Amino acid sequence: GYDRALSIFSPDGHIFQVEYALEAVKRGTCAVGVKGKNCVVLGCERRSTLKLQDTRITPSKVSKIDSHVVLSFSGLNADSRILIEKARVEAQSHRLTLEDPVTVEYLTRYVAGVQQRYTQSGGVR
Amino acid sequence: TSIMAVTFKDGVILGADSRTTTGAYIANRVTDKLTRVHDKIWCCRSGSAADTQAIADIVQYHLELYTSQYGTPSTETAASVFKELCYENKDNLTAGIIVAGYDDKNKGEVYTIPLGGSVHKLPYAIAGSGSTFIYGYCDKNFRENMSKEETVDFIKHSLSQAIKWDGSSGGVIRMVVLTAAGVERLIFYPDEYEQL
Amino acid sequence: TSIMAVTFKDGVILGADSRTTTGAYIANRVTDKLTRVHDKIWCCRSGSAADTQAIADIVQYHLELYTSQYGTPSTETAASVFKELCYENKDNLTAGIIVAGYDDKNKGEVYTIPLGGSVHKLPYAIAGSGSTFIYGYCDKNFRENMSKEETVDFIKHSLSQAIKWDGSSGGVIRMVVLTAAGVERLIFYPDEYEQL
Amino acid sequence: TTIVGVKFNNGVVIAADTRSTQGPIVADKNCAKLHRISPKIWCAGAGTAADTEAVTQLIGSNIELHSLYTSREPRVVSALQMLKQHLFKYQGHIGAYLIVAGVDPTGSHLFSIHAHGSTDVGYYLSLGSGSLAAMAVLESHWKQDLTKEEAIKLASDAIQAGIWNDLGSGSNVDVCVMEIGKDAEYLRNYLTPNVREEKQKSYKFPRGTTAVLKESIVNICD
Amino acid sequence: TTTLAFRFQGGIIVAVDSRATAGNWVASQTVKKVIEINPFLLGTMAGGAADCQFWETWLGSQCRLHELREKERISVAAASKILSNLVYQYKGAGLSMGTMICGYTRKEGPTIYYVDSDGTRLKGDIFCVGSGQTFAYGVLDSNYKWDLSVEDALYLGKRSILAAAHRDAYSGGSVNLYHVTEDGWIYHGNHDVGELFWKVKEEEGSFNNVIG
Amino acid sequence: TQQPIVTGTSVISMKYDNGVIIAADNLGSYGSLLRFNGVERLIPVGDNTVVGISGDISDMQHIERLLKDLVTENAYDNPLADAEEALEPSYIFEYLATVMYQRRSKMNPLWNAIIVAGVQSNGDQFLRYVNLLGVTYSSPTLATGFGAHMANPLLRKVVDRESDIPKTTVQVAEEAIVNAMRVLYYRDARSSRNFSLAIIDKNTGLTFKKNLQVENMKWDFAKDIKGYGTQKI
Amino acid sequence: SDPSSINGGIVVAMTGKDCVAIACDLRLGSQSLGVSNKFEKIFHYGHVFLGITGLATDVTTLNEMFRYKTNLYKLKEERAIEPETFTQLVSSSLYERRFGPYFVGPVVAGINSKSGKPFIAGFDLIGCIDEAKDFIVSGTASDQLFGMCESLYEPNLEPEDLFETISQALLNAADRDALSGWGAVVYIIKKDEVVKRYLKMRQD
Amino acid sequence: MDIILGIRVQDSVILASSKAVTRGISVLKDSDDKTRQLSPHTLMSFAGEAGDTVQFAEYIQANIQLYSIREDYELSPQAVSSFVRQELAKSIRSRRPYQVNVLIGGYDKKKNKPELYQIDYLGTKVELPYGAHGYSGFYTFSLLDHHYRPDMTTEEGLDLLKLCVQELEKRMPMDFKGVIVKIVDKDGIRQVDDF
Amino acid sequence: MDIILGIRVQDSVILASSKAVTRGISVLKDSDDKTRQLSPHTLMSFAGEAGDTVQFAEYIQANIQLYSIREDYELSPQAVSSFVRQELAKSIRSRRPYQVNVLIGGYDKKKNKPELYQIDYLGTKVELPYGAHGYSGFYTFSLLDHHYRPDMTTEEGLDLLKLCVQELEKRMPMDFKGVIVKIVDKDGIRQVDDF
Amino acid sequence: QFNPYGDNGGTILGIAGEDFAVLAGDTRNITDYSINSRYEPKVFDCGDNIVMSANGFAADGDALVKRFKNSVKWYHFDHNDKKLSINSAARNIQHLLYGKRFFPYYVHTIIAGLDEDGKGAVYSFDPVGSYEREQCRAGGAAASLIMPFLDNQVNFKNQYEPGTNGKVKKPLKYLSVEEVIKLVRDSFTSATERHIQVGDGLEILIVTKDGVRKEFYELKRD
Amino acid sequence: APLX
Amino acid sequence: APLX
Amino acid sequence: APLX
Ligand SMILES: [Cl-]
Ligand SMILES: [Cl-]
Ligand SMILES: [Cl-]
Ligand SMILES: [Cl-]
Ligand SMILES: [Mg+2]
Ligand SMILES: [Mg+2]
Ligand SMILES: [Mg+2]
Ligand SMILES: [Mg+2]
């Protein structure tokens, strides 16, 4: 198996691969979240250099993880699908064992844990 | 057990080891497996000790009653009585018996009666667990019309080898000589026969 | 099967019958149970035909690879390779093998390997179902430092008796002579050995 | 059980231990394994306890009737023949393993009988679970031409071997000496090498310790 | 064993016997068949002594890890399902357990789950488990009402174990009582059947089959 | 799961004032067939230990190879291999005991009963038993198979407890062992007349005696025994 | 399906100074199910007492059989049967069913009216007599009874002291057995008076 | 077969017996009377192996009726129970034993007392205040241990019996189709039609 | 477990499942719901080995719910039944197979048709107008062969179902404590509370 | 077919006092009806004032003791030489036993020592790790003989105050070390009388705050 | 191994 | 049983 | 199977 430590510390104490991943996020289309007194609203930018698009079938920017939680993102689109899939699987697994849907904090903690794991695992960016 | 009976010029000689077994334990190291059913009709016993004793006792009774009415029975007759008991009760018996006797008309005769209760008249017979190891030796060394001393040596050497290889055989070598002269008992101890 | 190997003055001779059995049916009446694992190291096979063939083939391969690196293997070494296979696979094997070879330093040597995979170095060895019937005969007739002609007669007479009493043995008597002179194969047919 | 029989100069002696077991538990620490068939014919029994007692009594009963019928003192071979034919008939299901010994007009005799009905003759014999421990001693110390006192010593030593080394055997040594021309002498508890030591404490309870619900006088009279 | 637990107006009553047996041999008369998982959760034991004791204390450790990770006491449903999913993995291997997970939480209220070693998991108001379960049912069912007082409910649970202890040869020793409220579980003592039987017989007038 | 094929019978042993004695016959049985007669079942390890083995002979030969290898391995990088860091009887035993119990735990046992006899570096007698189950025990006398039933009772008459050991000489001890071997030949159906005996003494060291025979046997009384009850001739 | 442990129960007997005691539990069950707490296992024929453990149907059958036989004995003999003689009768009767036995563990207890000697005896299911100076035990808690009797017993106890010893032997043995207990009865037997006492014991 | 119960109160014995006859996966009948009158003041209920039960019950009935005609007299419940026990005690060592369990409820006219006997197929007899055969006992015994009193009336006994049937109908796996209840007292045997 | 039934009528699928959970000689529960909603228009009832049933049902439920979230779409009853069949077909050659029999009642919104699938533990799937698992079928199939018509209403289906339960309550050996009835149609899944 | 288990007999016994605890065991070791050793100890000092015995199949017993002794050693290495309390030892032994739940150690385990308040403690285990603290426990072959005697004499079961109508129980009190040793010796002599696998010698290990002391007594050798 |  |  |  491919083992290379890709995410490593530099002399100044930075992990450049993690910091360069943040640059990919900075390149991505803008996403915003605002929560009110009785709701949360997720807004997302879609770039207009793409005309002749089919908006019926094109992947939406906001994804349902469960019937009560949603996930939007900024950065690499292909990367986000992997996180969304894992989150959706964990959502159903939680319902199965705890007999209760995930809290938003728990679902977030899981997704964040996955992201962290990819910063000190060999062979992955 | 290792047993045998061998006809020769003057009559017949029976031979046997002296081991009784109860698993790998020797319950009796000085057993007498050569048994009188009539004055000059004897048998070698192999298989179950209880079965062969019970059979021999019944045969002795039958021949004693035969003698009271019709005089001395033939060796063939004695073998027929053994057969009748062994054949008809084959399901409940474990008895391998060699019958040997001396007539004056018929001289020495040997009949072997295996597990099924069949009868086989032979010049000599071997039986018991230890016999397996001396089929080769006995076939190569047996001759008809041997002398008394030759026949004693043949049995001694044969049973010596049977005893050597068979764990279920051992102790002393007993022998019974049946001739016109009478009945002679012989015994041979380990210190003699082991170093043959 | 009836098999044996016998050391003598000039080396060692292996002997075997030619019967393969499939129940009471003789699947092969001209079988060769004497098998080359090296130029002057041979073996007698008894037990399962498939098991003993598979083992012999593996041993031959091991000794061929040994020879390529370290030169001619000893007879002891060959027996050790047989043992290793028989011992470690004792649960899945039915193989009674006699290993026999000729060194110039050690002369003739015989190793017998029974079912469990133990090794026993002996002056001569007998094995197979038919061996039971010749323990008495072979013990009484074997002498050390026999001649070639005497050893051939000893094996011929021994296997003749084994074949006579064992239903699982028969056909021809094959023999392989191992000496400094080389390797000689001998065969003896029923019409000769039966009337011994 | 450990039982033995030993022949000597002018007769025969038999001996036995006094432990009876049920599985690993000791039921009687002093049972009698030496049985009287007739006044001068005694037998030592191992195996199924009820079988040895019952078969011993039945043949003993028939031997008495036979003795009265024939106006003769009973012979050991008669007891031997009657026992073996009875046991053989039951194909080993009557688990009686016996050492039969005694004196009669013919002389002194020593036999053993197995459950399936086979009999043996000998100068020294041992049966039971401790027979191997006993036979080891007998094979080591037995000789031809033993005296009375030597045979008793040998017999009891053979039983002791069973007592100490066999878990099936224990407690005491019983002996019976049958000498020609004399009365048989039964020596109950000839050796008692397993006396219980003094207990550390008395477990006598204060009167009233046990709680009682009802009392009543029981009528045993008519 | 005989163990029971029932739901009622004033919470949950849990009652168990204290006998352990190896065949007909009475191995112990003082076994603790209730395990205190946390101040709000109880577990009952029936079947294999080691199986129950080992895995229910293991369950307690899993519940502790939940409240460390989630900053919240585990639900009765989730706690019972950890045990049921555990034994289901071992299904066929020969575990022997008849357990009841009893407790209170805010979202659930008083809750009882039956969990056994072939993987059965059932929510319910009344259960009796063990070799003497039927004897306990007989008394419990024929006297049960939802509107029992705390005092009466405690007695009925105690009386039901006593009934089974008496009739079932493999039940006995003493009765351990528990009461589960919104504030947690409360221990209501160890009651030896040696004294309790005669006390109940005299005061209640029952057990007329027995020689007084 | 196994079944033993070629087997060895009893191994017997005892302690005496200055050391230990151990013995075993030279037979390799094949069921009821007394197949092999030149089998050595006592295997010395160094000059202070003898391992006596009964049961399956193929497994015995495997154990021989293990002990042989243990001597080789102990000598590696060990300047005191023939002095303070030589193999003790206690080390050899514990190794075998470990192997025996591990093999039984994998349901593939070495089908043997083993007695390790020797003398420790401080002069103490060593005598301990181990078998296919990994069961271990020590006693002034130890024996396997039929020896346990027939030899132990005889050897215990000489040394019945610990305090009897100083009172027992090598002459008395060897006499008891040789007697026990005779009794086993009378009574064990898988025994031979030929045997080996080994003495490990704290003063005179290891004495290994080969090709011993059972002698001074009593058979003469057999001639007087006729029939099985009523037969006179 | 082991006939001797379907119903459960125990019996114990002891000797004292010029007296004997015999005691039994009261349980009758069907494996785990306790059915009856009034099932006495001790009977008497004249002054001879018999306790029987094991399969309850055989306990009842044998009581009826020995009542039958002792009644005919008394009519023909014109006297009550003695313990030594009755012991032999029990042994004969059990061995008669050698290969189809009653699954029982009987215990005889009593005082010989002629000699005044205390007598106890025990049997296996097929008749083997077990005589004892001290005590006899029987039933599903026989191991427990053996342990209690061997430690608690001393010779020549007075009737009042013997009562305490035998009662404590039975009670503590029964409480370690699932199939024994549910009440107990003790008989104290002197030369010409017999006292019967029911013991208070735990009812689980 | 399956469920048979018995309760002895102050002045009567009450027997309750299930009505179902099941073979395989089919309830063949739901009105079966699992009882026989042995004499005017003695009733026997039965449960066990198919065929054996009725064959045994009727055989006993014939014998008691024969006795009644011969002596012009009614056997006591105790005497009948002992006769029945002996027949079962004989049976258990026969080539093919009767696999039948019974309860015998009777009123002894000489003693003026109700009596209930429980006898299993082995011939194990006990006199009891209340009894049951089969799996029924595992529920009813503990229930009756609690609620039963020795001085109860017939009506109190019937209510006590209703409590048992209700428990069995709640916790028993099989549908036994209710029970037929019969009372045995000084005036003989009568059936309760509405239960 | 034990009794699960299914009837497909004109516009709906009706599932009836017994409420009893029995272990040994004790009915531990009489209100057990032997069903799981896999999707808004798909219901699965189940019966078989203890533990296996619920474990399997919930495992399938989780997978279908996962699919629904991923695709934002409801699988057809046919598609769900094929998925379930394959899981059971895998299971039967595993080290320890799921011993669970199921009925799947669904309403296909694209076809506007009710659909009933019967699948046993071996993975044997059939589409049927009416179905049953276990011993129930031995009574209900012949009954439905006679009384069933393909154009029946939901109410007619419920009356047809009452006829089945009545027959089972009459002839079945065990007390299964009634049934929970659920209807699957164009508007989804609902429970009949008074049956 | 190979049977990996055996039965080495013997019996053990643990009693706890106020400031002490004893763990006793006979020194006999057996297989079937043979004695392997008259003195083979099976009660061991495991350090930290904990004594332990694992009675039944001796190979499993030795393996378990060996593993626990090793567990104590590593407990010191990993937790700064901290003393392993008796309650912690008990829990650790449960995991040792249950770790082989599907191929069990064939032994009844008993440990003894002092709890963290200085009071006597006895813990007992079943073969697969179920455990419980008690004042009293007998284990092994003669457990069924000794245990009911202990219920009666240590915990005063079935004993009421005289004259109180069976209403007031005999009050519980701690026993002195002298009284406890009397009960141990009487328990073992009684067990030796009636159980064939028990005898030869008795070894008692007494545990106080001062350490572990040993006492040895002869038992009957039959 | 006890049961409960 | 005894064999020969 | 073939044997030798
Ligand atoms: Cl004979
Ligand atoms: Cl033979
Ligand atoms: Cl070939
Ligand atoms: Cl072959
Ligand atoms: Mg021999
Ligand atoms: Mg109870
Ligand atoms: Mg009890
Ligand atoms: Mg003892």
Side-chain angles (χ1 to χ4, degrees), chain C residues 1 46-47 127-130, chain M residues 4:
Chain C
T1 301
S46 81
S129 59

Side-chain angles (χ1 to χ4, degrees), chain D residues 9-30:
Chain D
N9 282 342
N10 204 39
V12 60
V13 51
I14 58 165
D17 77 302
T18 63
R19 176 178 290 184
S20 63
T21 58
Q22 359 174 106
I25 302 286
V26 180
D28 195 346
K29 318 199 235 156
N30 216 168

Side-chain angles (χ1 to χ4, degrees), chain E residues 129-179:
Chain E
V129 183
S131 61
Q133 66 188 60
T134 58
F135 301 107
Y137 274 132
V139 170
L140 182 51
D141 289 327
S142 58
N143 286 110
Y144 176 83
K145 290 169 176 172
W146 178 265
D147 305 307
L148 263 42
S149 59
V150 165
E151 197 187 34
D152 289 341
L154 279 163
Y155 181 80
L156 179 54
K158 191 205 290 177
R159 184 61 183 76
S160 296
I161 293 294
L162 179 57
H166 180 53
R167 282 286 177 177
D168 179 23
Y170 304 112
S171 291
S174 57
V175 192
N176 281 116
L177 265 173
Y178 286 86
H179 180 216

Side-chain angles (χ1 to χ4, degrees), chain B residues 1 46-47 128-129, chain L residues 4:
Chain B
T1 305
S46 80
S129 59

Side-chain angles (χ1 to χ4, degrees), chain H residues 22 24-30 135 138-139 168-177, chain I residues 22 24-30 135 138-139 168-177:
Chain H
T22 308
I25 58 166
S26 298
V27 181
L28 298 174
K29 199 175 172 181
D30 62 5
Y135 294 120
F138 283 88
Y139 288 99
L168 295 166
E169 282 178 351
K170 181 165 173 62
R171 297 296 182 182
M172 281 274 160
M174 78 300 174
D175 193 346
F176 61 89
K177 305 296 185 194
Chain I
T22 308
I25 58 166
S26 298
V27 181
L28 298 175
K29 199 175 172 181
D30 62 6
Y135 294 120
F138 283 88
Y139 288 100
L168 295 166
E169 282 178 351
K170 181 165 173 62
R171 297 296 182 182
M172 281 275 161
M174 78 300 174
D175 193 346
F176 61 89
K177 306 295 185 194

Side-chain angles (χ1 to χ4, degrees), chain H residues 109-165:
Chain H
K109 296 282 278 178
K110 308 212 82 167
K111 289 179 167 187
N112 291 301
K113 269 179 159 65
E115 281 179 357
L116 174 69
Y117 297 95
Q118 186 177 135
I119 312 170
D120 74 2
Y121 73 104
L122 302 170
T124 314
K125 192 183 94 175
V126 179
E127 202 284 316
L128 293 168
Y130 39 91
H133 273 300
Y135 294 120
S136 309
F138 283 88
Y139 288 99
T140 59
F141 273 119
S142 59
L143 192 153
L144 267 14
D145 284 351
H146 184 49
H147 292 113
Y148 176 87
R149 301 289 183 278
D151 66 332
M152 290 170 87
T153 57
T154 302
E155 271 295 320
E156 284 174 304
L158 290 164
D159 292 337
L160 197 68
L161 195 68
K162 282 183 78 186
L163 225 57
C164 294
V165 173

